[PDB]
Enzyme design. Structure first.
Site, PDB file in Angstrom:
ATOM      1  N   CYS A  89       0.797  -1.181   0.020  1.00  0.00           N
ATOM      2  CA  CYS A  89      -0.054  -0.099  -0.068  1.00  0.00           C
ATOM      3  C   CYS A  89       0.930   1.404  -0.035  1.00  0.00           C
ATOM      4  O   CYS A  89       1.655   1.429  -1.108  1.00  0.00           O
ATOM      5  CB  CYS A  89      -0.888  -0.096   1.251  1.00  0.00           C
ATOM      6  SG  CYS A  89      -2.347   1.244   1.138  1.00  0.00           S
ATOM      7  N   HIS A 137      -3.875  -5.261   0.563  1.00  0.00           N
ATOM      8  CA  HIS A 137      -3.317  -5.525   1.841  1.00  0.00           C
ATOM      9  C   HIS A 137      -3.453  -7.149   1.678  1.00  0.00           C
ATOM     10  O   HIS A 137      -4.520  -7.684   2.067  1.00  0.00           O
ATOM     11  CB  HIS A 137      -4.047  -5.142   3.024  1.00  0.00           C
ATOM     12  CG  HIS A 137      -3.792  -3.775   3.315  1.00  0.00           C
ATOM     13  ND1 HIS A 137      -4.241  -2.629   2.603  1.00  0.00           N
ATOM     14  CD2 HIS A 137      -3.056  -3.125   4.497  1.00  0.00           C
ATOM     15  CE1 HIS A 137      -3.843  -1.401   3.381  1.00  0.00           C
ATOM     16  NE2 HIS A 137      -3.193  -1.789   4.264  1.00  0.00           N
ATOM     17  N   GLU A 145      -2.251  -9.620   3.428  1.00  0.00           N
ATOM     18  CA  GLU A 145      -2.276 -10.368   4.714  1.00  0.00           C
ATOM     19  C   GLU A 145      -3.718 -10.907   4.977  1.00  0.00           C
ATOM     20  O   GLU A 145      -3.717 -11.941   5.681  1.00  0.00           O
ATOM     21  CB  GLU A 145      -2.149  -9.561   5.808  1.00  0.00           C
ATOM     22  CG  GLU A 145      -0.967  -8.568   5.854  1.00  0.00           C
ATOM     23  CD  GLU A 145      -1.263  -7.260   5.385  1.00  0.00           C
ATOM     24  OE1 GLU A 145      -0.771  -7.047   3.970  1.00  0.00           O
ATOM     25  OE2 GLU A 145      -1.521  -6.482   5.678  1.00  0.00           O
TER      26      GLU A 145
END
Length: 252
Positions: free
Chosen positions: A104, A224, A226
């Site tokens: 990001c 993102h 994750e």
């Protein structure tokens, strides 16, 4: 026992709660390739010139951690805070061939650092920080508010390390939270240099994945990743980082 892989996380802090998903995604990848993860946390500010002047012990503590790192990560925290130190960490990973991942705001800073030191636009900046910046490389581009939820990202090419790690799919779906994007007016200045925009939103207005040629693993990502990592399927951008950090990337 297990072989150690040392990763430097260049952000705001030790492990604090908002890095929870980032840690988990790093653990899945380390366990997957059979390594103990040694996560070293660096307060971005500690790498800056100001800290050398005012707290040299801290400055050298930070630089020793960065310099022994097998791989480097700039996660997607928010803020103008420690922006300068993050840029310093990205130059290091770039020039010294260290495996790198930018998430990001991390991706956006890698884009800027490249313009600055490889394309020689010395004042390339983000309007998030100087709203009147003369060279507006990163700009405010909201969906007419912020790009949110699960969204599509479409690969623009077949020669991509991330495409391969993601299983050769022509597109992926990940979670987003951003409104500052690469300026389409400045995209042309990147042609025939080593940084490629390898991924895009569906509309084709937002560059969302970058890769660097002539580097073992230098990857940037707008979303993102994750948020969809799991123990039996580690988030591929993170798995690539760990594979490269241990020299096992080709073999896989």
């Amino acid at each position: 026992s297990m072989k150690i892989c040392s990763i430097a996380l260049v952000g705001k802090y030790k492990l604090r709660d908002c890095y929870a998903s980032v840690f988990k995604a790093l653990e899945h990848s380390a366990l997957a390739i059979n390594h103990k993860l040694n996560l070293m946390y660096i307060d971005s500010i500690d790498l800056e010139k100001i800290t050398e002047t005012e707290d040299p012990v801290k400055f050298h503590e930070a630089w020793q951690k960065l310099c022994k790192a097998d791989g480097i990560l700039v996660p997607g925290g928010f803020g103008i805070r420690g922006t300068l130190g993050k840029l310093q960490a990205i130059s290091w990973a770039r020039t010294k061939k260290i495996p790198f991942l930018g998430v990001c705001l991390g991706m956006q800073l890698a884009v800027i650092e490249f313009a600055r030191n490889c394309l020689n636009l010395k004042d390339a900046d983000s309007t998030e920080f100087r709203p009147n910046a003369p060279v507006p490389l990163v700009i405010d581009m909201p969906e007419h508010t912020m790009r949110l939820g699960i969204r599509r990202t479409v690969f623009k090419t077949e020669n991509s390390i991330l495409r391969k790690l993601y299983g050769d799919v022509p597109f992926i779906e990940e979670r987003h939270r951003h409104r500052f994007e690469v300026n389409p007016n400045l995209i042309k200045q990147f042609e025939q240099n080593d940084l490629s925009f390898v991924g895009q939103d569906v509309d084709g207005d937002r560059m969302e994945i970058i890769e660097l040629a002539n580097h073992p693993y230098f990857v940037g990502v707008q979303f993102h990743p994750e948020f969809s990592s799991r123990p039996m399927k580690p988030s591929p951008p993170y798995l690539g980082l760990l594979l490269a950090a241990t020299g096992n990337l080709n073999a896989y």
